[PDB]
Amino acid sequence: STGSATTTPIDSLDDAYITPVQIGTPAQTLNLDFDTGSSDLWVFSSETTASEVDGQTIYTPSKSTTAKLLSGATWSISYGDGSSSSGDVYTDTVSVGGLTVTGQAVESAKKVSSSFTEDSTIDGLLGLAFSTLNTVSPTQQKTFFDNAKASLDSPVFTADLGYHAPGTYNFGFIDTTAYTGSITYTAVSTKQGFWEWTSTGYAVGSGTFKSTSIDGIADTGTTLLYLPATVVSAYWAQVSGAKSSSSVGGYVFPCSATLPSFTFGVGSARIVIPGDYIDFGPISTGSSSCFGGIQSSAGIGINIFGDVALKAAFVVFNGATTPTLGFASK
């Protein structure tokens, strides 16, 4: 089997991408944030505290003839940005782009943190990291991809995120028309539960490529590119007037600037992030200070190849017995 679904930016900045997901019988379609940095499929629901729902579409398990309470199971997650959610668990039928999994754990939120409530466009998350990170207790549950894998034509999914435009998540096949050149594959460590890999270096604009190992994770659920402070300083030094602002929380730059590109290495291959992709717009409405899309990871503990980087590539998440990642230009 295969599946193919369009993923759509939630706003004009590409802050996140939503993909329609069918849950239950009859289908209830929710728009979920596909997140290769986490491993829970959780949804706003009829169980979510009413004051914490503000415009989201909810899953109502009592209206699904295939929903079954997973007795005794609870979940609770905290994300790298400080947000969180928690609740109980049902199993139900879940379909993405024509690919159906029966008995998928659907984690129903009883509580969500304010950042989720305040984002009316995201009805939940669909985690695509390794199932060892799934938070369901006392019996850890598998991701949608883990459940589908054995049925897929090939045990892979691909992320093709658009810049200011829709893109595609495919399951079970490589669309060879969706990229240019070849796909360069690189080793993955699953020891932390992430799609963790090592970039071979970087360049700023037309500058020389610096060969250096940068370990990080491919994370569709993170907006920006978070890299070591040395690398980030080298980038922003090429933008007149850019500076790190403690009060804003990262590098800012004059909105009048033209940003240089940023290149990262994948083996001997190179992925070029155009400068435009690094502009996240005014820090507040009407400001002439703009927020940068490349930020330091120093306070995180891990480097994160988030959407800024991934949307410059066609990305293969190869879930074979020994997982690997593939990157192609597009």
Swiss-Prot record:
High-level lineage: Eukaryota, Fungi, Dikarya, Ascomycota, Pezizomycotina
Reactions listed under catalytic activity: Hydrolysis of proteins with specificity similar to that of pepsin A, prefers hydrophobic residues at P1 and P1', but does not cleave 14-Ala-|-Leu-15 in the B chain of insulin or Z-Glu-Tyr. Clots milk
Disulfide pattern: C255-C290
Keywords: Aspartyl protease, Disulfide bond, Hydrolase, Protease, Signal, Zymogen
Span of the entire protein shown here: 90 to 419 of 419
Top-level taxon of origin: Eukaryota
UniProt organism field: Cryphonectria parasitica
EC number: 3.4.23.22
Name this protein carries in UniProt: Endothiapepsin
UniProt record similarity statement: Belongs to the peptidase A1 family.
GO biological process: one example: proteolysis
Domain Peptidase A1: 17-328
GO molecular function, one term: aspartic-type endopeptidase activity
